[PDB]
Design a protein around this ligand. Structure first.
Ligand SMILES: Cc1cc2nc3c(=O)[nH]c(=O)nc-3n(C[C@H](O)[C@H](O)[C@H](O)COP(=O)(O)OP(=O)(O)OC[C@H]3O[C@@H](n4cnc5c(N)ncnc54)[C@H](O)[C@@H]3O)c2cc1C
Length: 533
């Protein structure tokens, strides 16, 4: 409805945390800037994922913007870990406060973008037949998207109520009196299930791969504490910027292998009772050493066995075969405890795979389960999923999809050679999903918008990563990743390992603070590694 400009200094794709701050900062810097967003309003993942139990896995006081002193002073977080409704209210507050929606076109999807060498501009097309000419294109298009896979066979035949965690109804769903099925036990499944368990007459959880999850220990945020923090919030967030992960997480000095079974249990139990993801850094080698990881993994496995009364059910819930904590750690709220309710039933689909969804419910090899409601608790596509849905064409009409088929090739994760004037916020090649994303998003938006400002200040119009420096960066990312357990997780690679072909690990794992220092050095040296004309 709001018409996008025909010409703009910067076009931003996406109106979540990334796109909104890019918009705001480019305005402040005196540039012309517009946003295109698929959704009807702001929020990004916090707009589109609205299933009950959706909640951030790092603390509220950390997972927030810091760019505005007034925002910091005026917003009251109510809980240790904020719910999606609260996060969405916060994002709407920011957009409201700074009149940001005047700079956004909603209900509109960018379908293609092509670089034009003559003018040093991007021409961008949308699914409403808009054409925009921007000098710079910022992809604030996110890291998590709906997977592009067919649904289970027979899904369209289900005769009951069907829900998707990825597109949950806007009005509340009452499961009272119902036999409900939940398919999927990743992040969405683990968060949504205990909420459904509160209402359903019966609940069947269809679990394929068991995932690691630790207790949130969520609690109301003491108003007195928050008021005290607000007096020194700038000092606090500068402390967060100077860490590997972008939060105040204690860095455990010891090796998980150097302690007695006794000290390990004592230490890991303290983390279990405190709750949250800080357990990931209980010891220094959890993500470096195969045996160090398995030791922490085993303790968690035993917590599952301890919590779930039925030992057969408990054993099916235990993650096996793969390392702990190589992805964002899921916080659970009575997910394990849930299985002790008489009305909750675990269906192990590794043992009995789903044959088909039926009109009555779900059929495995063993039996049919009759259900009144079925919830699909879907996972997420590769980090590159959003980008790959757009036909992006660079120098020589090369498709970004083709160049990145063996993995995302970038310099600092910020730009790729052959695709001038194009920038990625919080994406492959940078700390991204392996950090407090609000800290990474702010660093990236500041770096990219500062760079765009510098260009205009010096009368330049074309910014391209130097190919040698991209190759060095890619290799450097691989080298440091190969020193960790992260490569053990298939989702951090695009496609399988093929002899005699390159393979690029998705993310920088060397620590946010170290990455920040690199980026600052690059900027200080006049953008060393970019060719600017
Ligand atoms: C349940 C859950 C828990 C989370 N917990 C944590 C946590 O513990 N810590 C943490 O750091 N992060 C967490 N996150 C990750 C979260 O995604 C990021 O922190 C952050 O919100 C990403 O913001 P973004 O702006 O970069 O991307 P997004 O929020 O994904 O926004 C991208 C936007 O781009 C739009 N878009 C994409 N392609 C197009 C196109 N072609 N045309 C138009 N629009 C397009 C999308 O519609 C979307 O609105 C969590 C996310 C979820 C879902």
């Amino acid at each position: 409805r709001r018409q996008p400009p025909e010409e703009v200094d910067v076009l931003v794709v996406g109106a979540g945390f990334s796109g909104l701050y890019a918009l705001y900062r480019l305005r402040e810097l005196g540039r012309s800037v517009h946003v295109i967003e698929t959704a009807g309003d702001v929020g990004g993942v916090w707009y589109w994922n609205r299933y009950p139990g959706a909640r951030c896995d790092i603390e509220s006081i950390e997972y927030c913007y810091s760019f505005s002193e007034e925002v910091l002073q005026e917003w009251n977080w109510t809980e240790r870990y904020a719910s999606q409704p609260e996060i969405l209210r916060y994002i709407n507050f920011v957009a409201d406060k700074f009149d940001l929606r005047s700079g956004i076109t909603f209900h509109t999807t960018v379908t293609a973008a092509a670089f034009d060498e003559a003018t040093n501009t991007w021409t961008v097309d949308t699914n409403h037949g808009d054409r925009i000419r921007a000098r710079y294109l910022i992809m604030a298009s996110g890291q998590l998207s709906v997977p592009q896979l067919p649904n289970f066979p027979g899904l369209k035949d289900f005769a009951g109520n069907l829900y998707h965690t990825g597109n949950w109804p806007h009005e509340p769903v009452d499961f009272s009196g119902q036999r409900v099925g939940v398919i999927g036990t990743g992040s969405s499944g683990i968060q949504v299930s205990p909420q459904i368990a509160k209402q359903a007459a019966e609940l069947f959880v269809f679990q394929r791969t068991p995932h690691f999850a630790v207790p949130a220990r969520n609690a109301p945020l003491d108003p007195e504490f928050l008021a005290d923090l607000k007096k020194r919030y700038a000092e606090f967030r500068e402390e967060s910027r100077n860490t590997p992960g972008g939060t105040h997480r204690y860095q455990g000095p010891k090796s998980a292998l150097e302690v007695s079974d006794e000290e390990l249990v004592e230490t890991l139990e303290r983390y279990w009772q405190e709750g949250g993801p800080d357990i990931l850094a209980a010891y220094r080698d959890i993500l470096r050493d195969r045996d160090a990881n398995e030791r922490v993994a085993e303790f968690i496995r035993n917590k599952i066995r301890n919590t779930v009364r039925d030992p057969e059910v408990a054993e099916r819930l235990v993650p096996k075969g793969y390392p702990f904590g190589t992805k964002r750690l899921i916080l659970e709220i009575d997910y394990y405890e849930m299985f002790n309710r008489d009305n909750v039933h675990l269906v192990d689909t590794l043992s009995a795979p789903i044959e088909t969804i039926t009109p009555r419910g779900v059929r495995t090899s063993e039996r049919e389960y009759e259900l009144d409601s079925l919830v699909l608790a879907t996972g997420f596509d590769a980090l590159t999923g959003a980008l790959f849905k757009i036909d992006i064409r660079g120098v020589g009409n090369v498709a970004l999809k083709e160049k990145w088929a063996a993995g995302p090739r970038t310099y600092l994760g910020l730009s790729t050679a052959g695709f001038p004037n194009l920038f990625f916020i919080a994406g492959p090649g940078s700390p991204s999903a392996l950090s407090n994303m609000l800290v990474s998003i702010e660093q990236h938006v500041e770096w990219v918008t500062d760079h765009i400002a510098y260009m205009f200040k010096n009368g330049l119009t074309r910014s391209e990563a130097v190919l040698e420096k991209e190759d060095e960066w890619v290799e450097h990312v691989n080298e440091i990743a190969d020193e960790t357990l992260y490569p053990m997780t298939a989702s951090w690679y695009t496609g399988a390992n093929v002899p005699g072909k390159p393979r690029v690990f998705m993310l920088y794992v060397g620590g946010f603070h170290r990455y920040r220092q690199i980026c600052d050095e690059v900027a200080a040296k006049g953008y060393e590694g970019f060719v600017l004309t």
